[PDB]
Design a protein around this ligand. Structure first.
Ligand SMILES: NC(=O)C1=CN([C@@H]2O[C@H](COP(=O)(O)OP(=O)(O)OC[C@H]3O[C@@H](n4cnc5c(N)ncnc54)[C@H](O)[C@@H]3O)[C@@H](O)[C@H]2O)C=CC1
Length: 244
């Protein structure tokens, strides 16, 4: 289904990104594991096997993004799918207590990093689309982008940026045969969950359980597949009903 495709996934050394890298590879994709956590990237890539390449990079820095893209193209010759999944947050707290240094770092990863990775790959994607090869950008946002609860204000707003840029890129890039979509996950069983924080979260999800990486990975695999070739500009909630 993703056979022949090459997916570059940021933040794939852990959590949701790790689940997507594994699910995509099981679907026949080559996967470029881009993460600032070199040990996690290498573990995931080694667990997947020869279809995975680990790339250590801080996607908030332009030089690292240039190097990660060059590495992906050297190894696999093309990139078909970009998954912007890397992200950081802040501990829940009153908004006015997040100081500018922490605010700036969160924007650097969740906003600038998406901008850098997307901007660097758009020329390649346009080349591919001109050859009749559709490309997909998938951005991982959050139910908090449009359905926030108190105490995660600046994190949630970066995910609102992501949902917005998904729409804006989608309408601009559709004639180039590039689709741009987003996923809005609810609280998931990843290492980052203790930062945004379990019975209280579970009971707030109408379907009655937390999201697991495998759940989100299936929606990502569908949206990045040719079976979704007319789906673009959407932000799909994968949340057990939390956003209703
Ligand atoms: N876990 C949850 O409850 C929810 C998470 N999200 C978003 O899902 C996405 C994946 O997060 P999780 O898997 O849960 O957390 P995670 O911490 O397990 O995985 C995030 C990975 O991105 C990497 N990362 C952070 N900054 C980076 C940078 N400059 N450059 C390269 N890699 C960087 C991290 O090293 C990490 O391996 C994130 O964007 C997160 O904001 C959205 C709402 C719910």
């Amino acid at each position: 289904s993703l056979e022949g495709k090459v997916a570059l996934i940021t933040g794939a050394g852990s959590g949701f990104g790790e689940g997507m890298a594994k699910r995509f590879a099981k679907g026949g994709a080559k996967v470029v594991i881009v993460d600032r956590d070199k040990a996690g990237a290498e573990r995931v890539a080694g667990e997947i096997g020869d279809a995975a390449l680990a790339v250590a990079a801080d996607i908030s820095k332009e030089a690292d993004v240039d190097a990660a893209v060059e590495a992906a193209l050297s190894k696999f010759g093309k990139v078909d799918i970009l998954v912007n999944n890397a992200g950081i947050g802040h501990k829940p707290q009153n908004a006015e207590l997040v100081e500018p240094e922490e605010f700036d770092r969160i924007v650097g990863v969740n906003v600038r990093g998406v901008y850098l990775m997307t901007r660097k790959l758009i020329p390649h994607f346009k080349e591919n689309g001109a050859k009749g090869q559709e490309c997909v950008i998938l951005n991982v946002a959050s139910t908090g982008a449009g359905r926030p609860r108190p105490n995660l204000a600046w994190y949630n707003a970066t995910k609102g940026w992501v949902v917005s840029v998904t729409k804006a890129l989608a309408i601009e890039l559709a004639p180039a045969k590039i689709r741009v979509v987003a996923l809005n996950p609810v609280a998931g069983e990843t290492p980052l969950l203790t930062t945004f924080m379990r019975k209280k979260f579970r009971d707030s999800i109408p379907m009655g359980r937390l999201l697991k990486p495998d759940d989100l990975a299936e929606a990502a695999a569908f949206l990045c597949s040719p079976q979704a070739s007319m789906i673009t500009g959407v932000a799909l909630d994968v949340d057990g009903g939390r956003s209703i």
